[PDB]
């Protein structure tokens, strides 16, 4: 099931908020930078594409 977890941290006037969502073994991460998200990872594993089949 999807787990709705989140955390905040106002450091040096910098409200950092991380959105943890665990569903099907996928914990998404959304760190808030200056009130603006700029991070997106899953279980600490950035994903995008793989042009090289190898």
Short mmCIF file of N, CA and C in Angstrom, two decimals:
data_model
loop_
_atom_site.label_atom_id
_atom_site.label_comp_id
_atom_site.label_asym_id
_atom_site.label_seq_id
_atom_site.Cartn_x
_atom_site.Cartn_y
_atom_site.Cartn_z
N UNK A 1 0.86 -1.22 0.00
CA UNK A 1 0.00 0.00 0.00
C UNK A 1 0.88 1.24 0.00
N UNK A 2 0.32 2.36 -0.44
CA UNK A 2 1.06 3.62 -0.48
C UNK A 2 1.15 4.24 0.91
N UNK A 3 2.37 4.56 1.33
CA UNK A 3 2.59 5.16 2.64
C UNK A 3 2.80 6.66 2.50
N UNK A 4 1.95 7.44 3.17
CA UNK A 4 2.06 8.89 3.11
C UNK A 4 2.94 9.41 4.25
N UNK A 5 4.22 9.62 3.95
CA UNK A 5 5.15 10.13 4.95
C UNK A 5 5.85 11.38 4.44
N UNK A 6 6.12 12.31 5.35
CA UNK A 6 6.79 13.56 4.98
C UNK A 6 7.53 14.14 6.17
N UNK A 7 8.54 14.96 5.90
CA UNK A 7 9.31 15.60 6.96
C UNK A 7 9.76 16.99 6.54
N UNK A 8 9.86 17.89 7.51
CA UNK A 8 10.27 19.26 7.22
C UNK A 8 11.47 19.66 8.08
N UNK A 9 12.19 20.68 7.64
CA UNK A 9 13.37 21.14 8.37
C UNK A 9 13.74 22.56 7.95
N UNK A 10 13.45 23.52 8.82
CA UNK A 10 13.78 24.91 8.54
C UNK A 10 15.19 25.24 9.03
N UNK A 11 16.16 25.12 8.13
CA UNK A 11 17.56 25.34 8.49
C UNK A 11 18.08 26.61 7.82
N UNK A 12 18.60 27.52 8.63
CA UNK A 12 19.17 28.76 8.11
C UNK A 12 18.18 29.45 7.17
N UNK A 13 16.91 29.44 7.56
CA UNK A 13 15.87 30.07 6.75
C UNK A 13 15.63 29.27 5.47
N UNK A 14 15.81 27.96 5.55
CA UNK A 14 15.61 27.10 4.39
C UNK A 14 14.70 25.92 4.74
N UNK A 15 13.41 26.07 4.44
CA UNK A 15 12.45 25.02 4.76
C UNK A 15 12.60 23.84 3.81
N UNK A 16 13.29 22.80 4.28
CA UNK A 16 13.47 21.60 3.48
C UNK A 16 12.42 20.55 3.84
N UNK A 17 11.64 20.13 2.85
CA UNK A 17 10.60 19.13 3.08
C UNK A 17 10.77 17.95 2.14
N UNK A 18 10.79 16.75 2.71
CA UNK A 18 10.97 15.54 1.91
C UNK A 18 9.69 14.71 1.89
N UNK A 19 9.20 14.41 0.70
CA UNK A 19 7.97 13.63 0.56
C UNK A 19 8.29 12.16 0.32
N UNK A 20 8.03 11.33 1.33
CA UNK A 20 8.28 9.90 1.22
C UNK A 20 6.98 9.16 0.91
N UNK A 21 6.96 8.47 -0.23
CA UNK A 21 5.78 7.71 -0.63
C UNK A 21 6.17 6.29 -1.03
N UNK A 22 5.80 5.33 -0.20
CA UNK A 22 6.23 3.95 -0.41
C UNK A 22 5.09 3.11 -0.98
N UNK A 23 5.16 2.82 -2.27
CA UNK A 23 4.14 1.99 -2.91
C UNK A 23 4.79 1.02 -3.89
N UNK A 24 4.47 -0.27 -3.74
CA UNK A 24 5.05 -1.29 -4.59
C UNK A 24 6.57 -1.26 -4.51
N UNK A 25 7.09 -0.95 -3.33
CA UNK A 25 8.53 -0.92 -3.12
C UNK A 25 9.16 0.26 -3.84
N UNK A 26 8.49 1.41 -3.78
CA UNK A 26 8.99 2.61 -4.44
C UNK A 26 8.80 3.83 -3.54
N UNK A 27 9.84 4.18 -2.80
CA UNK A 27 9.78 5.35 -1.93
C UNK A 27 10.25 6.60 -2.67
N UNK A 28 9.30 7.42 -3.10
CA UNK A 28 9.63 8.64 -3.83
C UNK A 28 10.18 9.70 -2.88
N UNK A 29 11.08 10.53 -3.39
CA UNK A 29 11.69 11.58 -2.58
C UNK A 29 11.50 12.94 -3.23
N UNK A 30 11.02 13.91 -2.46
CA UNK A 30 10.81 15.26 -2.97
C UNK A 30 11.30 16.29 -1.96
N UNK A 31 12.56 16.70 -2.10
CA UNK A 31 13.14 17.67 -1.19
C UNK A 31 12.76 19.09 -1.61
N UNK A 32 12.37 19.90 -0.64
CA UNK A 32 11.92 21.26 -0.93
C UNK A 32 13.09 22.24 -0.80
N UNK A 33 13.39 22.94 -1.90
CA UNK A 33 14.47 23.92 -1.89
C UNK A 33 13.90 25.34 -1.95
N UNK A 34 14.09 26.09 -0.88
CA UNK A 34 13.56 27.45 -0.81
C UNK A 34 12.08 27.47 -1.16
N UNK A 35 11.34 26.50 -0.62
CA UNK A 35 9.91 26.40 -0.89
C UNK A 35 9.66 25.96 -2.33
N UNK A 36 10.62 25.25 -2.91
CA UNK A 36 10.49 24.79 -4.28
C UNK A 36 11.19 23.44 -4.47
N UNK A 37 10.42 22.42 -4.80
CA UNK A 37 10.97 21.08 -4.98
C UNK A 37 11.99 21.07 -6.11
N UNK A 38 13.10 20.37 -5.89
CA UNK A 38 14.15 20.28 -6.90
C UNK A 38 14.84 18.92 -6.83
N UNK A 39 14.19 17.96 -6.19
CA UNK A 39 14.75 16.62 -6.05
C UNK A 39 13.67 15.57 -6.25
N UNK A 40 13.99 14.54 -7.04
CA UNK A 40 13.05 13.46 -7.28
C UNK A 40 13.78 12.13 -7.44
N UNK A 41 13.71 11.29 -6.41
CA UNK A 41 14.37 10.00 -6.44
C UNK A 41 13.47 8.91 -5.87
N UNK A 42 13.80 7.66 -6.15
CA UNK A 42 13.04 6.54 -5.62
C UNK A 42 13.94 5.59 -4.83
N UNK A 43 13.69 5.49 -3.53
CA UNK A 43 14.52 4.65 -2.67
C UNK A 43 15.99 5.02 -2.82
N UNK A 44 16.25 6.31 -3.00
CA UNK A 44 17.62 6.79 -3.14
C UNK A 44 18.24 6.30 -4.45
N UNK A 45 17.43 6.27 -5.50
CA UNK A 45 17.90 5.79 -6.80
C UNK A 45 17.28 6.61 -7.92
N UNK A 46 18.01 7.62 -8.39
CA UNK A 46 17.53 8.47 -9.47
C UNK A 46 17.35 7.65 -10.75
N UNK A 47 16.21 7.84 -11.41
CA UNK A 47 15.93 7.12 -12.64
C UNK A 47 15.48 8.08 -13.73
N UNK A 48 15.81 7.75 -14.98
CA UNK A 48 15.44 8.59 -16.11
C UNK A 48 15.29 7.76 -17.38
N UNK A 49 16.42 7.33 -17.93
CA UNK A 49 16.40 6.51 -19.14
C UNK A 49 17.70 5.71 -19.26
N UNK A 50 17.80 4.93 -20.33
CA UNK A 50 19.00 4.13 -20.56
C UNK A 50 19.20 3.89 -22.06
N UNK A 51 19.75 4.89 -22.74
CA UNK A 51 19.96 4.80 -24.18
C UNK A 51 20.88 3.64 -24.51
N UNK A 52 21.87 3.40 -23.66
CA UNK A 52 22.83 2.33 -23.88
C UNK A 52 22.27 1.00 -23.38
N UNK A 53 21.90 0.13 -24.31
CA UNK A 53 21.35 -1.17 -23.94
C UNK A 53 22.41 -2.03 -23.25
N UNK A 54 23.64 -1.94 -23.74
CA UNK A 54 24.74 -2.71 -23.16
C UNK A 54 24.43 -4.20 -23.22
#
